[PDB]
Amino acid sequence: FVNEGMRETFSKALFDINMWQPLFQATKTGCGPIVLSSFTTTTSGYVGATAGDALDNPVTNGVFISTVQIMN
Amino acid sequence: PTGKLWRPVGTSVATIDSLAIVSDRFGQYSFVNEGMRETFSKALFDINMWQPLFQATKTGCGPIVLSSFTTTTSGYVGATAGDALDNPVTNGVFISTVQIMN
Amino acid sequence: NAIRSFLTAWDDIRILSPDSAVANGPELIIEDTGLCTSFMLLDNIPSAHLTKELIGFTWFMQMYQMTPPLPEGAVNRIVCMTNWASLGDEGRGLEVRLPPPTDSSVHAYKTVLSRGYIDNAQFNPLALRSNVLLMLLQFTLSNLKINKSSTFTSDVTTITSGRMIRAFEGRPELLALAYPGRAVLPTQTKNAQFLSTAIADRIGRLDRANLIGGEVSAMVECMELCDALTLHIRETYIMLLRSMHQDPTQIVQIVNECANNLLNSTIPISLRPTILCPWFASSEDLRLQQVMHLVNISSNTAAALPLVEALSTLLRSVTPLVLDPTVLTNAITTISDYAAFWKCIASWAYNGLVTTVLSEDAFPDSSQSITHLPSMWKCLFLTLAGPMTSDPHSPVKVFMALANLLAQPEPIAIGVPGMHQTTPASQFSHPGVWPPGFLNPQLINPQQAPLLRAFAEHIRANWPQPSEFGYGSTLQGSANLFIPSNRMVYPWPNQPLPRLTVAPTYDSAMSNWISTTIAFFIRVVNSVNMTATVNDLTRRTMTGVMTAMRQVKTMTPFYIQHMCPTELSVLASVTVTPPFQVPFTRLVQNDVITNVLVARVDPAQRGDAAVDIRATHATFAAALPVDPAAIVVAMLCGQTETNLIPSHHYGKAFAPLFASNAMFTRNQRAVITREAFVCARSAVAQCQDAGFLVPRPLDALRQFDVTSAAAAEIMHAVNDAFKTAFDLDGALLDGLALYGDPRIADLSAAYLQYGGNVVREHVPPGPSHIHRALQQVESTFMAEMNLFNVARGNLYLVQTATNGNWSPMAPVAAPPFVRGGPNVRVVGRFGTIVPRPNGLEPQLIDDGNVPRDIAGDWVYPSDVLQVSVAVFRDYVWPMVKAGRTRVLVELGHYVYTLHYYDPQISLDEAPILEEWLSKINPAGIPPVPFCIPIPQVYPCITARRVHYAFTSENNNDSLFSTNAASIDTAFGENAAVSPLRWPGLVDPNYRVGTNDLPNRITLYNSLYRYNFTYPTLDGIMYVRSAT
Amino acid sequence: VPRPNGLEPQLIDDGNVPRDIAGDWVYPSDVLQVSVAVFRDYVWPMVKA
């Protein structure tokens, strides 16, 4: 799960990169602006640290990032 | 979302270039993401606390609500037209430059 | 009548507008200029003739007396009576006239299940919510009218001088009532004191001139008295109308498009501040109207057939195509009316409500050979005519007919289990039964069964490819279910009418079919096998005839592929009943609609699974038998009139059609079926405990669980009420209450395709204005039931011999004893008295089941009291008359009826009561009888009288005021005129348009008198012109 | 198409955009056949003038 504040970071990190947009095109590197909404998803279920406690966090259409994504 | 808010500019469909930082007579509305309100609230909260001493000494000017410096605009909010296109926010809470000043 | 005439430009001839009835229109516009009310202040007990004192005003010498605006005299209640001050042209025969609380209001509560067993003197307590819902539904419908604005006259009566009041020519008596406070004679008397605090300003009309067209205003703001409930119902109906208003100007385009430009017109329409054309129904609605006709027709084929001939007429009476075998006969004869046909094209327009199958006679008995000539011909006619039908199973039945005939020369195995090459062709009528060999020609062998592998090969690659085309206008509203909006589905491939030539007239889909088939059979009648019985000469004569047919120059194949779509496209718009049409399918097997069905509730939530009766019939739609032998002729000889400019022809024909405003009757009967539905579904969904989500403002009223059979009556009462209110023709909504469960949730029509797939068109009725009002009314009935005589709360029966003050209605003293209180015993079911041998006194059977004794105080659930009144009246009732026992009957609500008496005439109440007990029985209780003392104006020595009844809740809210003609009252329960009823007239903080509705029916409101004009189009209509 | 309070009746031109009678018209004969009733009542009184 990508709790509210943890999106602040990855957004604040990507925000500081998007800033350099004019230099990415100029030098043909990069690959377009990096939206954090490209690494996440909209699954829904119970989200906790263990079956026991995850049972008390029914989240619907929350925004989670899969492992292989947490990689990119 | 984060950054300044943008809105479609000129003739055409919304697109990555339709957008333009919605600036104006007040400066540019920059979005006030959830956590960044925690700070300005935590800062104002520590001031409101001293309410009884502000009246006593006729200084101050009433309690400072953070909802007096913001607004409820809506548009796309990003760091650049390209990426701001993926953050359509409706009636978000932005604080204009001249306000970010007060 | 939306359209009245249509002077056609080219012809210059004014076409004026005109088991299945002729759909007429709903009486959508009724209006009365009289007071907008249905709660009069009828006085009950007349006044004891006081000595006037202050008489009328004195202008110079004359002395002007004015009629007392409010009811005066002893006790004046608020007796409910729809259109009591109605001063308009007419009223939808159906109202609510309840007699003052002093009479048996019982009758008005006997619709639903009451009729039959209940004595005319008592209502059914068990069916009360069901009977109050229907009672209000008539109080609504009754009040569904528009408020013409009448003619004002500047009032010059001092206090109110300057204010523009309203005339009231019909009966000047109203002018008095209409504006209370206007010229109030200072005669200090309850009434006069109140009317004195009336704001001079509130009286008359509010706004200034406004949209003054000509000299009359478009819509004024009269202020006259008008019970918020009635004012709110009408303010709903005004909306119901506006809702379905149709922009008059757009009407030109609707006709222009609905006719495909063949006919183009122009209709000048003076736009005004007011104007109202209730001719438009949204596609959102039209679909609930479609699935609606689907319910009334049901499995009944006789009611569906009227629809396909209605079209079979219009079609033929408009086609440029003229069928005639003269040419065919000649051609054939050398070497040797067509309802069937027209009831095959009009059959496609309803392919889904009634398919057209091939008469079983057509098929050649599977036990017959192909060598048998009469047989092989009965087969050739069964092919040439095959595609012409709308049976999803024709491509098979056809192929099968030949698989039958030559069962021995071409003995090919049939895949479908339990079936053999010799199975009667007809028999195959399910996408399952289809032979695999037919589904894939490859399976058959060229040399094993030559003819078949060649015949299936033929059909697999020749049977016309279905198609479609748009139709009607886009500003219309689909009204069709399965196939895309305003756009039909045609059997053969269609194309824009090309300039007649040798090309399009031999290249049509049907030309190919007619051709390649005759081609194929010519090789069959020439088979080596034929030799067995076919002569060499006669075998040639066969090729001679079948070739005549093939080469005959028929012009229908071209019509059925270029000119026939343009007719249906149009004809499918000028019909009071739009075309129901399930998608066509050629050989795609698993997807060929097996069944079509209407569901009165999605299977999921459908308790008591009940399929749609339609399922019983073999083919999904009413199987109408069409004879191949006939259709083939029609198909093989359709020459058109020598001179023929398609433009001018179709033009002249579709002219008379758009002259009859039958296109708008459809939109109108539609918006009323959606009203009668969102209202029916609600009323039956409110009487059952579970069932469809509908606000239940009347859940407190006692009502047993309505079964399936019971609903059909709450359903006939609702459906039958609507028809009477809007005087409609045929079915409407009774289709729902004539079979299946009248307890409908949300209608939906769905067809299942053999490929195991169910497409289901849900059709939820968009917000019913009528119903929105009804709900608000039911909601009001709770906070104001006394105005309908019904009273809430239990009835106490403690005997009280006081000679003092009484008010059974709102008793000030504390409840004799609460139910779960100390020492009170609830009487057990049956309420059985148990006589006791020897000295011991008779004792009542306790609820705890252990018999207790009578002396004391019991709580009688009305249910028990009604199943033993005889035992009650002979054991506990007497024990009550003697101050020994105190009963407490429990009735949630009921119809009370009080009788006023002289506080000075000492009379016991027991008799006036048992008159009651006497009529109580299981089948129903008579109105509870309270006895209130007429409020005396002068101190009078009252007489001792014993009373027995009185309620727990205060139910004297009905009581409007007592002794309006006096400076006050000395004895009876005195009641000054409550300002609350008139927040508009009295209170300075009123707000034009503000109600109270859910809680308290206000009297002097602020209605909005309208002045609508009904434009009635009649324009010129130019055709297209050759070119 | 007729026009309100004293305005020239527009003659629906070819492009399908009503134009006005006081001018120069080209009448595709066929048109004139399914239309005379009109021609004679609005354009004719015009040609004479």
Next chain:
Amino acid sequence: AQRQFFGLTYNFYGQPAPLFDLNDLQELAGCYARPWTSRFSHLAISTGSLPVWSARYPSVASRNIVVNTLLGAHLNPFAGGQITSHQGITWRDPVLSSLAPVPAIQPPPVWAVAENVLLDSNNYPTYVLNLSSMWPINQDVHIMTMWALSDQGPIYHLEVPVDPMPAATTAALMAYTGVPIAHLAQTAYRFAGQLPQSPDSTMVSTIRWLSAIWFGSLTGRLNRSRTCNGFYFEFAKPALNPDQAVLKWNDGARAAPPAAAQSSYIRCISPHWQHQIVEVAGALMSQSVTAVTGLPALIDEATLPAWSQGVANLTGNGQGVVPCLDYNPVPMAAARHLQWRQDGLITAAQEAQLNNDYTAYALTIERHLTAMLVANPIAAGRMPIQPFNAADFGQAGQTAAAVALAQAMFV
């Protein structure tokens, strides 16, 4: 009631006399040469969808654009006190009805041709002393003022209170249901132009609530699934007559009253308003309100033409002014379709579809006006087109801010 309308005469665009000749006086529809209560006269009788425009009047706003310079050319009163006369044409008497040729024996003084003459209204004492008769003239002059204070589209005024629609408003509005925006402009105008009404009259707060309720629909904010209070405007296909609006009533999920007042003047920079009966209707439908109730505040000097700079009591520059958010038809409707897709009214395929079907329609509007301005220049005499220049037609100003105003006007 109300009597104190501050006006402003039309601009000359650098031309000698006012852009109109003698023939314009005896061609106006309705009442002879009476310019008062005209505007929506040639539309009194609807024949079809096709916009009413002839040879001399090449467009929809052509009828009004002409009655404007013709109006100002004969407005010495309120700005001088006299009656005067322009080219031998004057009013009959003090009531100011139709225009007849200068009466003999006692002819009025010749009007001194001048550009942009400030109207004070109180300067003509006869007006207040005869209000109930010459009332329409107040509504009309107000129109000319809103049209004069702009070189690109009439500047009307939206508002919407902080609280929900009154109880008398909701009952009055449920009568203009099946009525196109083209007709709502006709019923609105014909209302406030025949009898002195009050600023707080029921029909005034409802017609204003009907105008601002129309803007949200025009922006897409108030569609089929988001009503202001049960009222909206369903739009048809742009390729199948987009002029059709109609005030449909539903029972869906209403919006919510804004935190504060959203008073704001709006304009249509794109010269498209000229031929669009929908834009001209939306403008004049709002002007009917600011007529009975003078300007709620002053107009922003931010942009506007070079002649409306610092007017007497119309356009200011201080803090008592209200910003003017001007838009452009094409980008506005392009953003209007985008709103429908957001909530799920149209498919993501009909998003880029309705844009091509509309931009093609708005192209017809452009191809028409450009071809008319060349045919009818400006130095010729009249001004049925109003010289807009071909360098524009697609330079959308702060249209993106007008859309953000609708989102804020209905939260």
